[PDB]
């Protein structure tokens, strides 16, 4: 097994090329060291590294046979002895997802600039969706220490150019994610249950004020929730059923969970809302775990307080950890998706922390930020493509 | 968002191309529909589908700008309006793994012939290992109903050309495999414990006869095991410790399990050997589950019989199923790796049934057959590459 020899075929794709090339190579004394091939928009590139004897390699026989056979039918072929060339490419270090509606060329351009500026090469680019959102994957190779810089760079690009840009490690380990938890209110579920409840009271205004203030940061969650729930004092606890079946799942939420089931994920929710309303829905969606606060009921009437302990911001993290343990999933292989500053400790604690249509407070400490009203775009940050979802769904 | 326009750049890779192309496209009115890119052996192919107005598209402005910018620095670019072209490629239907030592060009050729004969196209080829075994992945698109035929075709190729050839579904679901069970004897572990025990008795000959006969098919496993274990009557049960720490893990077994842990697999063994010898080792390798037969000991002496129930061929399947349930993994998302006709019901029952250096009896009903004395090659049939293993291992 003397010298290495590199055959590279390019040109417009045609049937039988791969087979024609290897049938030819078999007439000489050839063993395969590596093979790479792809067709992009009817452009073939076929890259073969072979290990033949010094006899066969430095002999005009092999060269003229391959050159005759490729050129005879359309394509081009180069042939060069190396003995200095890598056999099998090292893996990408990271992967970057770009989601937009639309993704302007200008947006994509800004991404590549920052990538190139920071010494990163692009190993591959592919699409991972067309609808509801255009999704593009770049698998990249990042110099050590550029990692902190590159996210910084791309996060400016994100806000400027109006696309979602996420950077994830492209490792074996941190790719086998297997536990995900969703916030409920304005994540898995359209809107805020507590405003829907406060509306029954006639207090949607007082509450939606404090509500859009606590999940933005201005108010402590505990003292906010007590002042918010208080407004419900007097309501008949049948209000909980009314608002429960008044709820609308976020766009794509069913698709999101179904696909997560297909991939064998443990799924659960961690909320500061109310078990009574949530558990009804978590049965429907076959959830593995629920953590919520609880409304104190006295003679079929809410008293405007809750039954401790309070799932506060620290509570959400603690609940993710407890869920991780019972299911036997390391923390780094866990995912959290939430929208408010409520969700800061949870997202930080999780392996991959995703902010969904989230207040600036969360979108500034989250691993990844989505900004379209489609929860299924969570799947693209987890390595899934639309075409895959679409395929799997069609076999029922 | 009028007509679609397809830009395709090819040529020898150079820094800044991706960015140069999109910076240019931003000066016109362009939104990205799809992007595909790869560099194989310094050959760039960049494939962009854009969605610009009828104004921009049918205007010589865009064409001359892109054409000037690409050609100015080395590469070629075509540009054609389509409005009839697919946006985002459908996924591969299956994936084929070719493992050899070596993989001759002739071997690879035979694979591509059968592929082409049966109407299948190759979407991608990449390497997934160089050592210990050359590994090559072909992601293919298979016409419906060709599936049964294609495995048939490639299985002849396998035996003729001296490579391992496996065909797996390339679906979302049947790719998220998460539970694997190994046979112990001549799978996870070098050799046969019961011959190592029978040797202590002075009965290696009588036993290795019947042993290499039952895991080939000629003898019923129960009546074989009773006649085999019988030969141990009289031995002091301290023999079990002696043979336990006389065992050698199959080449790569530690790497196999470690990687499986990284990927968050439940791992276990299902044996017709002896809990007393096996459990010692299963603690070491942090196994989630053990199923084995058990040696009847009377006053520190083996009696040559076992304590029922007997893990027979049907037992192994039943044990996999029980393991699947306790861990909450559907059967189709389970993996079994074994070597004897002992392992037929288990491998059939499993989602993916892998025969490892296995008797013809198993290698004729197993989903996939390996034939090299390296158990880590199990990982390549599970979508892992050497470079990935090598990367993950190096971060400790
Ligand atoms: Mg929230
Ligand atoms: Mg066996």
Curated annotation (Swiss-Prot), chains A, B:
SUPFAM superfamilies recorded: ACT-like, HAD-like
List the cofactors. Mg(2+)
Provide the cofactor note recorded for this chain's UniProt entry: Binds 1 Mg(2+) ion per subunit.
Q: Name one GO molecular function term.
A: L-phosphoserine phosphatase activity
Superkingdom of the organism of origin: Bacteria
Q: Name the catalysed reactions.
A: O-phospho-L-serine + H2O = L-serine + phosphate; O-phospho-D-serine + H2O = D-serine + phosphate
Active site, UniProt feature: 183, 185
Where would I find the ACT domain in this sequence?
6-84
E.C. no: 3.1.3.3
Which family, according to UniProt?
Answer: Belongs to the HAD-like hydrolase superfamily. SerB family.
Q: What protein name does the entry list?
A: Phosphoserine phosphatase
What organism, scientifically named, is this protein from? Mycobacterium avium (strain 104)
């Amino acid at each position: 097994p003397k010298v290495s020899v590199l055959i590279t075929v390019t040109g417009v794709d045609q049937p039988g090329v791969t087979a024609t090339l290897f049938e030819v190579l078999s007439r000489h004394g050839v063993e395969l060291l590596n093979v790479e091939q792809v067709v992009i928009r009817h452009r073939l590139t076929l890259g073969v590294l072979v290990c033949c004897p010094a006899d066969v390699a430095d002999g005009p026989a092999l060269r003229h046979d391959v050159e005759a056979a490729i050129r005879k039918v359309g394509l081009d072929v180069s042939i060069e002895r190396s003995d200095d060339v890598p056999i099998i490419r090292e893996p990408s270090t990271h992967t970057i997802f770009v989601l937009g509606r639309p993704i302007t060329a200008a947006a994509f351009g800004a991404v590549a600039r920052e990538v190139a500026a920071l010494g990163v090469n692009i190993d591959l680019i592919r699409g991972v969706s067309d609808y509801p959102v255009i999704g593009l994957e770049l698998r990249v190779s990042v110099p050590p220490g550029a990692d902190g810089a590159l996210r910084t760079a791309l996060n400016r690009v994100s806000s400027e150019e109006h696309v979602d840009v996420a950077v994830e490690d492209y490792t074996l380990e941190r790719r086998a994610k297997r536990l995900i938890v969703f916030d409920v209110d304005s994540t898995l579920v359209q809107g805020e249950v507590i405003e829907m409840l406060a509306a029954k009271a006639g207090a949607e205004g007082q509450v939606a004020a404090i509500t859009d203030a606590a999940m933005r940061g201005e108010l402590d969650f505990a003292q906010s929730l007590q002042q918010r729930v208080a407004t419900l004092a007097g309501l008949p606890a049948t209000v909980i059923d009314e608002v429960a079946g008044q709820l609308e799942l976020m766009p794509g939420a069913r698709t999101t969970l179904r696909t997560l089931r297909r991939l064998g994920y443990a799924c659960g929710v961690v909320s500061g809302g109310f078990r009574r309303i949530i558990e009804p829905l978590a049965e429907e969606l076959m959830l593995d775990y629920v953590a919520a606060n609880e409304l104190e009921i006295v003679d079929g009437t809410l008293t405007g307080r809750v039954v401790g302990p309070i799932i506060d911001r620290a509570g959400k993290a603690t609940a993710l950890r407890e869920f991780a343990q019972r299911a036997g999933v390391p923390m780094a292989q866990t995912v959290a998706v939430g929208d408010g500053a409520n969700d800061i400790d949870m997202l930080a604690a999780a392996g991959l922390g995703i902010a969904f249509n989230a207040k600036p407070a969360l979108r500034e400490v989250a691993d990844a930020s989505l900004s379209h009203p489609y929860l299924d775009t969570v799947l693209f940050l987890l390595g899934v493509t639309r075409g895959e979802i679409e395929a799997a769904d069609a076999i029922d």
